[PDB]
Amino acid sequence: NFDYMFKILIIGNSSVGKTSFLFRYADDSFTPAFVSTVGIDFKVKTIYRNDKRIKLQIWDTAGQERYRTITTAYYRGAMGFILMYDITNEESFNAVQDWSTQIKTYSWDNAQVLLVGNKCDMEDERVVSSERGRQLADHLGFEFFEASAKDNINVKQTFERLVDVICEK
Numbered sequence: 001n002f003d004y005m006f007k008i009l010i011i012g013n014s015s016v017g018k019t020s021f022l023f024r025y026a027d028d029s030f031t032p033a034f035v036s037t038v039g040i041d042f043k044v045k046t047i048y049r050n051d052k053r054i055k056l057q058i059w060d061t062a063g064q065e066r067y068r069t070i071t072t073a074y075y076r077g078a079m080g081f082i083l084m085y086d087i088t089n090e091e092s093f094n095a096v097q098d099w100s101t102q103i104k105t106y107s108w109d110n111a112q113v114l115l116v117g118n119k120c121d122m123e124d125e126r127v128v129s130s131e132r133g134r135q136l137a138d139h140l141g142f143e144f145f146e147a148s149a150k151d152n153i154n155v156k157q158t159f160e161r162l163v164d165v166i167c168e169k
């Protein structure tokens with residue numbers, strides 16, 4: 001049913017929009033409701049790149065600290081990570097460094113990572129500049145993206161770039 005299968009994990013503080021990000025990408029759907037993820041969830045999505053069928057096993061992790069042990073247990077085997085924060089939430093941005101270290105502690109075999117500042121549609125409520133996001137991504141050695149699960153801005157682009165760097169690894 002596939003030529004390659006890439007395991008991808010979406011991590012970051014609770015409420016940054018990780019589930020919404022996946023919901024938009026996999027089902028082209030979005031819900032304004034906040035239904036916190038219990039531990040970890042996943043969605044499989046088959047994409048077609050260079051005439052090849054790549055199965056994307058996407059794990060949607062819970063952001064709350066109490067689920068750290070449950071979620072980090074899935075880091076090994078992950079080939080790509082979407083480290084997400086909310087442009088309207090400073091605390092979620094300040095947590096990026098620690099999320100980055102978490103990836104280093106539990107990930108294996110040079111997993112690829114993209115830093116994503118979600119909810120970019122909330123321009124009037126923005127608290128973290130794109131400049132700061134880009135600057136942190138650079139220092140962490142990650143490529144940067146700002147996106148919107150709500151307005152469907154850069155969700156596909158984010159996932160496709162991740163698939164590219166994983167494939168070209």
Ligand SMILES: Nc1nc2c(ncn2[C@@H]2O[C@H](COP(=O)(O)OP(=O)(O)NP(=O)(O)O)[C@@H](O)[C@H]2O)c(=O)[nH]1
Nearest residue numbers: 014015016017018019020032037063119148149150
């Ligand atoms: N305006 C806007 N709201 C968004 C966006 N993405 C997600 N949200 C909203 O932010 C809230 C939390 O989103 P959710 O996807 O549940 O976040 P999460 O990071 O998965 N949470 P947890 O880690 O607690 O499971 C929801 O109310 C959702 O509608 C976005 O791009 N724009």
Ligand SMILES: [Mg+2]
Nearest residue numbers: 018019036037
């Ligand atoms: Mg969630």
